[PDB]
Structure 1
Amino acid sequence: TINKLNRISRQMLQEMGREPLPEELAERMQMPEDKIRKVLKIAKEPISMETP
């Protein structure tokens, strides 16, 4: 789901020229916008406790 969201947001960005808003991404995925926001916020890799 994350990978194919990345690819669809890829294609939309390259076709319109700007970062696609979650509403248009949900429209292209045929999935609810709440699910799109859940996927987008799911888990970015934890930052290290030694970052200067």
Structure 2
Amino acid sequence: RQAITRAMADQARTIRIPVHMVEVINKLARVQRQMLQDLGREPTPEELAKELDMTPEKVIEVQKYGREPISLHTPLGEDGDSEFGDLIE
């Protein structure tokens, strides 16, 4: 379990996230899921911050860091030649 989760922290994401950041962010994700299944509603970030004893700006920062990039070559729709990569300047 240790080596598997270390490799998942180190190599899965395209942008490398250190293992302690990974364990912090997925602990926050799992306690957010616990909050969602407990009260049936989306909690404010202040509540999650105060129930985990970190600052709310830290929570905003870490859920901004915990994001997955979207591939450049996503098709737009019915048209096939028009790709997402030619829309960016």
Structure 1 and Structure 2 fold alike (TM over 0.5):
yes
Matched, 1:4 2:4: no
Q: 2:8 maps to what in 1?
A: none
Q: 1:13 maps to what in 2?
A: 36
TM-score by length of 1: 0.89
5+ residue gaps, structure 2, are: 1-23, 76-89
Distance 1:43 1:32 in 2: 17
> CA-to-partner distance for each residue in 1:4-52, whole Å, 9 max, x for gaps?
1001101111111011110111011110001000001114121111111
Q: Give the 5 Å matches for 1:1-52.
A: 1-52=24-75
| Cα RMSD (Å) | 1.0
TM-score by length of 2: 0.55
Structure number with higher relative contact order (C-alpha < 8 Å, ≥ 6 residues apart): 1
Structure 1 segments of 4+ aligned residues over 3 angstroms from their partners: none
* Bigger mean CA offset, 41-50 vs 22-31: 41-50
Percent identity over the alignment is 56
Secondary structure of the corresponding residue to residue 67 of structure 2: coil
